[PDB]
């Protein structure tokens, strides 16, 4: 599957920083920062640099417009929760497509957060809203009266998805070409009767990977310490899964990596 998603952040400064980023799968392609001389939407991927100045003027239009509403929204949220004006507060925006088998919308998103907690989110049916508290019910009532969910349907199943398909063709040589993981296993003792088998996976795109340590063929779901898929810095990602095994029993454990870049799931053995 494929996905486009935007991530907005607005932080209130007493006496507001507005950052927005756009992703196609695990590849960033656009950025807007209010803390710039002449703030503009700028390309972070090669396949959006070929878009015309008309596209970027249009993109910068909504960014500067949304930063204005984020100034109004952060101030409205202050009175909603009756908080003082001396503190900093965060308001995030998460919306985007999820592409399906044929090419149509699989899932649509439109989520708002306030201070790390859920605020209001467009339901999956793209007709109803889920308010997280009585303060968000004010925003909900505001949006049902203006038929905001009608606008999101036309975007998510329309402009959203059509442009996700457009990016995946204009950048098909990178967005649709998967890189296989370069895997290896390390072995470190933690006792005189115990060891740690660590299964590595480096330089793979996309970031979707599942590393599993199986003893005797069966999944050791727990006892398998796993870390966040981290970026390598060049567009690829890394990840490792570890398991603490008794010494002399390491020949019983096998690592299993499945990634879109692999022709078949490969079996590792330190």
């Amino acid at each position: 599957s494929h996905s486009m998603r935007y991530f907005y952040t607005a932080v209130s400064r007493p006496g507001p920083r507005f950052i927005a980023v756009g992703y196609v799968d695990d590849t960033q392609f656009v950025r807007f920062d209010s803390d710039a001389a002449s703030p503009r939407g700028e390309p972070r991927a090669p396949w959006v640099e070929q878009e015309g100045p008309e596209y970027w003027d249009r993109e910068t239009q909504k960014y500067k417009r949304q930063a204005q509403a984020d100034r109004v929204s952060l101030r409205n949220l202050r009175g909603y929760y009756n908080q003082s004006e001396a503190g900093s507060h965060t308001l995030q925006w998460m919306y985007g497509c999820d592409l399906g088998p044929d090419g149509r919308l699989l899932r649509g998103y439109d989520q708002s957060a306030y201070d790390g907690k859920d605020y209001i989110a467009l339901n999956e049916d793209l007709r109803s809203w889920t308010a997280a508290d009585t303060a968000a019910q004010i925003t909900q009532r505001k949006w049902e009266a203006a038929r905001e969910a009608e606008q999101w349907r036309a975007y998510l199943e329309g402009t959203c998805v059509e442009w996700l398909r457009r990016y995946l063709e204009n950048g098909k040589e990178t967005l649709q070409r998967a890189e296989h993981p370069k895997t290896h296993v390390t072995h470190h003792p933690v006792s005189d009767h115990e060891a740690t088998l660590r299964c590595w996976a480096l330089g793979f795109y996309p970031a979707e990977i599942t590393l599993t340590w199986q003893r005797d063929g069966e999944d050791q779901t727990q006892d398998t310490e796993l870390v966040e898929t981290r970026p390598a810095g060049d567009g690829t990602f890394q990840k490792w899964a570890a398991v603490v095994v008794p010494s002399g029993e390491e020949q019983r454990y096998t690592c299993h990596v499945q990634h879109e870049g692999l022709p078949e799931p490969l079996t590792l053995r330190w």
Partner: peptide, 9 residues
Amino acid sequence: RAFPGLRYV
């Protein structure tokens, strides 16, 4: 292509 409308609480 970002959302053309506006989010307002």
